[PDB]
Design a protein around this ligand. Sequence first.
Ligand SMILES: CC(C)c1c(C(=O)Nc2ccccc2)c(-c2ccccc2)c(-c2ccc(F)cc2)n1CC[C@@H](O)C[C@@H](O)CC(=O)O
Ligand SMILES: CC(C)c1c(C(=O)Nc2ccccc2)c(-c2ccccc2)c(-c2ccc(F)cc2)n1CC[C@@H](O)C[C@@H](O)CC(=O)O
Ligand SMILES: CC(C)c1c(C(=O)Nc2ccccc2)c(-c2ccccc2)c(-c2ccc(F)cc2)n1CC[C@@H](O)C[C@@H](O)CC(=O)O
Ligand SMILES: CC(C)c1c(C(=O)Nc2ccccc2)c(-c2ccccc2)c(-c2ccc(F)cc2)n1CC[C@@H](O)C[C@@H](O)CC(=O)O
Lengths: 423, 423, 423, 423
Amino acid sequence: PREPRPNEECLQILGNAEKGAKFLSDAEIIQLVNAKHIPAYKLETLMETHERGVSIRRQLLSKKLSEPSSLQYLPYRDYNYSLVMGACCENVIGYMPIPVGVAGPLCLDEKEFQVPMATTEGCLVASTNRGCRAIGLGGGASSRVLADGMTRGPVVRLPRACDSAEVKAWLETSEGFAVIKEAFDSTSRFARLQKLHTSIAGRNLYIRFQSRSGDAMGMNMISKGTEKALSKLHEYFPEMQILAVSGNYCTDKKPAAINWIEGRGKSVVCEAVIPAKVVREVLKTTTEAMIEVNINKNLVGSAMAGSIGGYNAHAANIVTAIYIACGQDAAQNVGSSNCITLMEASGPTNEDLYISCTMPSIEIGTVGGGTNLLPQQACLQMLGVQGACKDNPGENARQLARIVCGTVMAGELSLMAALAAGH
Amino acid sequence: PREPRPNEECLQILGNAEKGAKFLSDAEIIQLVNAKHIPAYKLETLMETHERGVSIRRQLLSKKLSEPSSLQYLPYRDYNYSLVMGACCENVIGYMPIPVGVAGPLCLDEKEFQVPMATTEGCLVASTNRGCRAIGLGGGASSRVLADGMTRGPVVRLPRACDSAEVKAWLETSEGFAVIKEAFDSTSRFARLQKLHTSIAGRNLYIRFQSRSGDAMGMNMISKGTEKALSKLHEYFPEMQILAVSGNYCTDKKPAAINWIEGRGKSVVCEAVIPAKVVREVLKTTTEAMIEVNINKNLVGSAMAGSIGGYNAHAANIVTAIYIACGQDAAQNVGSSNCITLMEASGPTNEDLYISCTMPSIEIGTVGGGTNLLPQQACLQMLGVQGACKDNPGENARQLARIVCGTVMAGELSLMAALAAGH
Amino acid sequence: PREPRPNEECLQILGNAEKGAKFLSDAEIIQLVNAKHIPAYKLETLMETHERGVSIRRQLLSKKLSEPSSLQYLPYRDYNYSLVMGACCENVIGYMPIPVGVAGPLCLDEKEFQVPMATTEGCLVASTNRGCRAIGLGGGASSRVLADGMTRGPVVRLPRACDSAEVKAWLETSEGFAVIKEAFDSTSRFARLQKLHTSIAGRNLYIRFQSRSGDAMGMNMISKGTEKALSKLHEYFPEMQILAVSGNYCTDKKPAAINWIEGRGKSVVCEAVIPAKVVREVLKTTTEAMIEVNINKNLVGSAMAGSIGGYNAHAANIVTAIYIACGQDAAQNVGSSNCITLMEASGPTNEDLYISCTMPSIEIGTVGGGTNLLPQQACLQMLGVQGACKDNPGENARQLARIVCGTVMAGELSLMAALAAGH
Amino acid sequence: PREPRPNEECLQILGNAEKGAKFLSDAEIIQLVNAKHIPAYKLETLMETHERGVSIRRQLLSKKLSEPSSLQYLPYRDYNYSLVMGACCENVIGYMPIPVGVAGPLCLDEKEFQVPMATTEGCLVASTNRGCRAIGLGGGASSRVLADGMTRGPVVRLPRACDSAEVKAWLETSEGFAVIKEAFDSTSRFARLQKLHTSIAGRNLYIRFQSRSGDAMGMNMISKGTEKALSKLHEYFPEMQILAVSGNYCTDKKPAAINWIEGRGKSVVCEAVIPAKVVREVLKTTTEAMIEVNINKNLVGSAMAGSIGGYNAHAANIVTAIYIACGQDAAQNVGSSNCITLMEASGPTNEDLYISCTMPSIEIGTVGGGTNLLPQQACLQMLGVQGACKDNPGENARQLARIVCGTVMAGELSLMAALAAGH
Ligand SMILES: CC(C)c1c(C(=O)Nc2ccccc2)c(-c2ccccc2)c(-c2ccc(F)cc2)n1CC[C@@H](O)C[C@@H](O)CC(=O)O
Ligand SMILES: CC(C)c1c(C(=O)Nc2ccccc2)c(-c2ccccc2)c(-c2ccc(F)cc2)n1CC[C@@H](O)C[C@@H](O)CC(=O)O
Ligand SMILES: CC(C)c1c(C(=O)Nc2ccccc2)c(-c2ccccc2)c(-c2ccc(F)cc2)n1CC[C@@H](O)C[C@@H](O)CC(=O)O
Ligand SMILES: CC(C)c1c(C(=O)Nc2ccccc2)c(-c2ccccc2)c(-c2ccc(F)cc2)n1CC[C@@H](O)C[C@@H](O)CC(=O)O
């Protein structure tokens, strides 16, 4: 065996360029960390490899648990931590595997997709698959991006509500907007300020900056632009106080009517027509029953529950699964699952099922954040939308938004059919 | 090398008890699947091991992709698929690793927790950690479960709105409620029907069944009980038509005022007091600035955005990270992140920061679904709440809800301090 | 002519029992008021008649206007001010005439009503009349009161959120509720506390007391009961601070999801079936067009606008007109107009139009407040619901609520037909 | 006495130019109406005077009532019906007197107003008066109009959601908007189309036209412009179906988040600062208590109730009273009472009370509708805003909106002080 060497030593070895770590033992590193000679947060750099750093962190953590063996089945080895450090997570102690299933082919805008879904919910993928099959037999779905821009809603404060009114008026003129647009756009090549939306509350002024952001989701870029624009605004109104760069007016990761009404990120609509025969044989129901259930659940039931933007069956399921599979920020599902599902009779006999899904606030990107990790990049690649689209910036993010809407629609179709048919 | 054998053969080998798979090659299985002799969804059972089944599925999928090499960095090997089959996912082609960091210790109700957070969002864990530290220096946090029961909101339809009124009246009497409660409770040992909430819309009657469910999240159990109760109800009103077992009146996985006002799952409140000195040194701000930002962002900004239940900074971040780490259904964050954050001055000098978070609709469990997988069980175990609590059923789920609320509060504290301090 | 006498005199005459007012002139009273010898608010008592007091007030006001002749066409004479003083208005300077039309007969629950509507909106009464005619030809409407109780939502505050939780738990037990119910019910013969609804936010506890109130609208009585109950509650928790007797949790005269979901005042549903032929000849449209418009305006359009409880065409018009005619508090229309209108196909051929209106928060009374004035009492009397119903307390208020719902439904029918038919 | 003459006769007299009505008796007219020889709706024209026509209508109505004497105290005589016929009401049977009190002087934007309030709610005027006094002692209030335009939200339908997207895109271009603006503006001199707001839901397109309308409230003018613009739009997309001229997307007379977020009619902010001493002596409270109550009632209590736009104490009371006094459409209070009230500490010592009211959707006019009647014109005249302002069109409506906001603020101040002080 062996025993730890004193603390005063073991820094000699740590320092030595040749005789570095890989000569110390785990217990020795533990001792050095417990003595404050190393900061634990740095263990992945000050250590021969990154995996060993997370190992050390795990051992330290285990010592403080009531059940020391808790981490046994949390996997941490043979994972590329270099892409996570300083980018994606801190105090890393391993990774959480989420099973990934595949729904498809989804026939959307004359193409076919195979949609990865990371879920632990049994039967979700199978239900989505049945919906995909129904749509495919129906002659495919169609989608359109209606609007596109990520937003940031800072709140600033003036000495008096009259001053706030003055600032609002100045922002509404062409000259003031031009100045703010120039300041905002100077911060990046994709920063192209669109029309501003202001709201006063007493001496608080809430300003909603909106802009396209290439293929990135846009939060960092929009925030940077917002900060620069607010500095410029401060130049004209030195009494202005920037209270918060986010005033919950964006609105980011909270339910808000503003996202529903004005949009946030990408606004999409998708539609399909399902023949009567296909509704009978694949969905095991009828068009009339589907419409009845749609009206009395997604419209009237949501209305009685007091829903804003929740006029759908389970869009959040599909959205969350895809988001986790493709490296999106999963909290954003809060806003991104806003959807209204409509079903009607169609065809020369009113026997076919027309269905449409409308999702005004799909917050999504294919560059930056979680999309920088290879496993998530794989799921993006199987869709054909990985990374930046050099020719037509933002095209990959738009395509991913369309696929999200189409998959949500297939899921709606399937779950609605199941509810209408009974058990 | 070798070449595939005919299709008529290769079923002989597949059938043979001794000379089964493990004698066929990958190309041979591919051929059999393409000929419809095997259903692909069954590949994980009709194959020597489960891993090989997912391998076959992956190869089939790769053939249909525009970039055949897309799956290269999607990991699938050395993962226990036995627990996922028939429970958690279908058409499995691997798993998605989510980095797991640790925030803590969180000092909550006189105990210390180490909270796992699965995220790809940089700096989230560090910010939560700073909040945890502030709370810890402040003398710890306190929490209470206020209400507990999962809900299912079926919609039924009567011939006339007068009939719907009759059914509603009958449900409101002690005898009718007793009959329905007996029918509902007969379906499981944890099914204990609480008071019903009805809403009429014309001839549609929406009924919200609520009940505790042990340590499970409860959806399956509540749905089963609801179905039995609806059959019983049909016995008294044979003209009733059960339109959908879910009428969006639960409300499950959609923003709804009903969850905010009546609660869903567990309702929790947490609070702490942060000394002025700690607010200065750890949070790098002052109590007055924190209160100003809290009022003008979480209350007024959310009000101007038209938020229902979104009166907080970023509760969805913390909720989503914990949910993914601990095997919860992540779509449920849609409802579970509803929170209101309040900050006030406190102490003999009004210099200390009182903070409270209130979350009325935390949907959460520690048994069933994603909590059946070992990696997620590890994260549950490091909290001390894994599985069913035999002595006091539901205690582990309640504890997990308390920890969720406390972590959300630490996150609020940190992010609010950052916004108040500026860059 | 004549000239004012000194100020020191003119109080002699004012004081004298025999030689009182009616001997002073208008200018003399004006002088006394301007000298502070009389308070203007008392002019209607310290004056030979009430009309003369309002006359004096009018002259005083006229002197301070930029156009002294402004009041010329504001009528004030031959009106009974005795019933308004100390009850209904202060600083009275006349009355505002609102034209009153009559819609009907409305065939409701096998009876016929003639509904007075006080409006200045052209064509409202005629449109309501056409709707009434359609309903009448359709075999009349049917209605039910589903729930009944006015509410008051005080807010109280505890030292800590844990204390608030304790109070909430205590209110939820049978013993605590019994004590509170006794205290509340002791304050009047109609005060019968129903189940309480609580909501915590940090250390704020919001309590919604609900109760029937006879035939009165109930606000005064409910408030009195609430105050008594809060005193009783304070006895058990001496640290409780009653922050406000109304915490906007009632919710009174503001849009709130709580009124929509839980009800406030009376909850009513009304329905009718309109034969296809009648829809063609009276409404000048078809059933299919009516349903299409109903779905895509009252459901989907309201959903896209982010409406809570506004799933109807113009219920506020009818509600406001009736309320003003019948002496109701017209501000209450804010909550009382919440309505959802549903239309469906019906009959053996799906050719007839089924319509239903559901209004969960009709706040209404037939005693107290504006219902104490004779002109408003006349409008109540032509409906047959004036004053208290001695046999069956609250029956007149319930009947008035039913009539309101039925008239709203007729208005919906007519306006929807007009919109569907085009110009 | 006398007896009715046959029916065949009595039309001779009715017809005769010289020997017309005024020779027939009331019973004779009754007989002619009952025989269908006269339509009752025309009684006010085919009769010597208008008053006599309403008299005849009253007698007819009385015959059909269960209590024939119901109309006795409903006044109808000595009222100018000429201005109501064909403009304001139909089937008129009299008028409803509403007592009118006066609150003021209100010191607003360096001027003084005397605000008429038509109410039957006891103590409302006195409370508003106390608020006015506090504001006056505080150095007056200040207000600003932030935005101004009435809206109409038609809904149109396309064959497919892709077609709806095409129409939306075309409306968003400068050329399409120019064409629509020209068509819309051609219909009146005040019709000046501002930027359009569209929302898709499947194949439904909801278009929100907004425009200033002079001093009129604007509904009729905006509707006319909308119809013309929709015809023009139909020229480019012949497959478009105009489903309804109002799709509840305006949104008119329903609670909707869209009015809160985008505004409707006039958006106003008012503010004042109340010295500490004045808060003590007039309001009988302290600044700290006022702020506490404001936060925990108007913000947190409204949030817990799930309010959109109802973050105030009782703005609907003031709004309704003024609207009824000044001839406004009182149903519009539903949208016009949306308000947020904010209170803060202010001054060199944080002892003074800053208060602000923000009302984004004040729907109001001073021409047309109820403002055409002399009694309502009197109330408009005492404010100085009656009729059209020839120099600066719309200035009178803007001034009236400012006064409404200021009066609401005084009412908030008073009621909040009363709640904070207790009984
Ligand atoms: C798998 C999933 C889509 C599903 C199905 C289904 O379609 N099965 C499927 C599987 C394989 C192939 C084909 C179909 C059934 C489902 C529904 C009806 C009949 C059978 C299954 C349900 C489900 C919905 C509500 C319940 F109460 C219980 C279960 N669920 C769960 C949905 C749930 O998470 C969200 C939802 O509850 C939100 C809401 O409605 O408020
Ligand atoms: C890491 C995270 C909590 C964070 C911090 C922070 O506290 N940094 C931190 C990291 C390590 C240690 C200590 C602190 C800052 C943050 C905030 C202000 C100053 C510095 C960092 C932000 C963030 C918030 C809004 C922005 F526009 C940009 C960034 N964010 C991102 C929050 C975002 O996801 C949700 C939020 O936007 C929702 C909303 O407010 O509407
Ligand atoms: C008289 C009233 C009911 C009416 C009619 C009608 O039915 N006319 C009637 C009169 C006499 C006999 C029979 C019928 C028409 C109406 C509607 C369509 C065609 C003809 C008249 C409208 C009206 C509605 C929206 C407009 F833009 C313009 C006018 N209005 C005004 C309604 C308005 O106040 C509220 C509403 O706008 C709320 C909303 O929809 O958002
Ligand atoms: C007269 C009115 C403004 C008033 C006062 C007041 O200020 N009195 C006044 C009169 C004369 C001079 C000075 C002051 C008191 C009032 C409040 C507290 C103490 C004394 C009176 C109340 C009132 C409010 C809620 C209650 F439960 C009961 C009464 N009310 C009735 C308000 C009510 O309609 C709307 C409100 O309830 C909406 C809400 O809060 O949800």
